[PDB]
Design a protein around this ligand. Structure first.
Ligand SMILES: CC(=O)N[C@@H]([C@@H](O)[C@H](O)[C@H](O)CO)[C@@H](O)C/C(=N\O)C(=O)O
Ligand SMILES: CC(=O)N[C@@H]([C@@H](O)[C@H](O)[C@H](O)CO)[C@@H](O)C/C(=N\O)C(=O)O
Lengths: 348, 348
């Protein structure tokens, strides 16, 4: 498919690498550092490599108008949700320390210029840009100036609109990933459009490609791996009974493990070429391919035809089924027994 | 991807249709009609649509040489295995009746001219050609002359060698499917090469494409569906404790159900285009996209710049983040409050 790659800290990502699953804790902690640690514990214990946060600074993120608009997966204003769920700077730094104390990589999504500057102070190794900000070219400009790789979600945006984001990113000189995304919580299977991934890699041949997902299970992400996806993002919770607008579409430890196992299998199985000769098939070819045999007794001096020849397993005959018709007209050099393989010495 | 389609009895197959899972009972019954019925029962009860048999007539299938060659997944000769497992004509007809008495479609793979003629007498609705016979052009010629659709496995064969089979098939005028296949029992993930499927559809634009699989689980088949596969073939047993060389890589009722559910999800999610506008995302765009706001108090008559402007959620401002730079140089038509959205009436 391609050889694009970059590193997130010590983790290589790309088509030739192991798919990377991002455990998006997001606002799932509902503003409680204690709940956030219980979720980081759950991710570590499940074998997680990366925990992603969301960095919400409500005042720099939203004008007063946001106190009057309700998201699709809630019944109160987006401002109220973020005020309730937002971790302040001190707590978020505690979160990063904790994630790295568990040997995992901490990254986050900034929703504001100020959140972007807070993450730079923390020196995070890579930046996620959510689909809501994929057309926020001033924010992308700022983040790209930090000099770290960017993982850009591309939901709600056209290839044309994404080109503008990618130009900014290329200008800064940082490697980037494009995640295909549908921003409905949860997302119906029929809206996922995994082909969107090929559209993206075709439009932007230097991007690492993956999927951010909000369906109820792992199937979309597994198909993304089969298609060449290198990064998989789902929401993550320690248990499904938690409250929160994103919980519904989250992995838990069990389904994270399933996805990790499925992704590993599909990383190995995907790609390659039809014509590749697999040494392991050799014993099968030898017994299963057919060879040319006499279909009747043939007297010395008789002509071989489609009437006294046929083809039978196994494949070790002097003449393969591929040469069947080349024996028509040959002269029987001796008596040929019905059912015997045609030998080179059976014809003049 | 494409609109190729044909019918197997009353079942449409093709990219625009529900993926079809073929429950390959094969030689799993070990020659016992009783065991074969217990497996047909298990398939029906799991929701199976198709049961595939193998039609073995040892004498027309193999010359005496087959009594000296051992398959990869056994330790006795291929002739011994088939002698032990082969159902005679009377029993195989009982098998077909039974499968159809359960409302399922019966098809089979012939390994010989005589088996092909036996299946024509039974008037089966479609023919499977196993990879061992994909280069048996005389057998393909015979089967194609029956006038039913053909599902051709293509393991162990090059695109070039398959062209010869497909030419024969086109000549007869029957629609066909090509199943990508690796004939190692079981098959390692790393040998599956799901890309082989795209190679096939590219070489043969009129073929229905699918996967015949011999890995230990469902992941290969799920990736095949994400790639556009229309037919999925695995071996099938009622329970994993049975004896037989193909049991190891078979579905049972539980894993058949998982694959059926995964295939349905991936049929809905696959394909499509990145730029498609999903009505369900509309509430997210409205709250998540940014609008241009004042970044400081701006006095009437002052110029708007990148220094007194910024962008914040939500998206209902007079000026979107896409028009941010078009406001530079505009003249403040009144005093503008820090944090207020820029209104059309705020500029001269
Ligand atoms: C549109 C948006 O901002 N959606 C984020 C989500 O948590 C929502 O805030 C909750 O649904 C609020 O109800 C998240 O999906 C964005 C993202 N990538 O798309 C990232 O966090 O990188
Ligand atoms: C090479 C071959 O003949 N393989 C068949 C398999 O059952 C073997 O007989 C057992 O492994 C014997 O040990 C089967 O895979 C072929 C097929 N499509 O490939 C079909 O039946 O249509």
């Amino acid at each position: 498919q391609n050889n694009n790659e970059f590193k997130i800290g010590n983790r290589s990502v790309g088509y030739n690498h192991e798919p990377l699953i991002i455990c998006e804790i997001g606002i799932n902690h509902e503003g409680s550092l204690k709940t956030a640690f219980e979720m980081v514990d759950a991710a570590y214990n499940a074998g997680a490599e990366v925990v992603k946060h969301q960095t919400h600074i409500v005042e720099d993120e939203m004008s007063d108008e946001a106190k009057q608009v309700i998201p699709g997966n809630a019944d109160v204003s987006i401002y109220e949700i973020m005020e309730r769920c937002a971790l302040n700077e001190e707590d978020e730094i505690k979160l990063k320390e904790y994630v790295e104390s568990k040997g995992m990589i901490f990254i986050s999504t900034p929703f504001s210029r100020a959140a972007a500057l807070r993450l730079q102070r923390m020196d995070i190794p890579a930046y996620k840009i959510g689909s809501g900000e994929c057309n926020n070219y001033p924010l992308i400009k700022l983040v790209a100036s930090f000099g770290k790789p960017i993982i850009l979600s591309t939901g709600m945006n056209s290839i044309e609109s994404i080109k503008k984001s990618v130009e900014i990113i290329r200008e800064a000189g940082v490697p980037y990933a494009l995640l295909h995304c549908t921003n409905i919580y949860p997302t119906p299977y029929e809206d996922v459009r995994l082909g969107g991934m090929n559209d993206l890699s075709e439009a932007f041949p230097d991007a690492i490609i993956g999927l951010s997902d909000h369906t109820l299970d792992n199937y979309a992400c597994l198909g993304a791996v089969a298609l060449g996806g290198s990064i998989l993002e789902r929401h993550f919770t320690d248990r499904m009974d938690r409250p929160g607008p994103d919980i519904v579409c989250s992995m838990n430890p069990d389904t994270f493990k399933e996805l990790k196992q499925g992704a590993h299998a599909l990383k190995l199985a995907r790609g390659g070429k039809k014509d590749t000769i697999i040494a392991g098939e050799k014993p099968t070819k030898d017994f299963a391919f057919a060879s040319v045999v006499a279909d009747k007794d043939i007297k010395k001096g008789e002509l071989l035809s489609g009437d006294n020849l046929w083809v039978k397993r196994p494949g070790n005959g002097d003449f393969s089924v591929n040469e069947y018709e080349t024996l028509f007209g040959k002269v029987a050099a001796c008596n040929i027994r019905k059912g015997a393989q045609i030998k080179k010495t059976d014809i003049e």
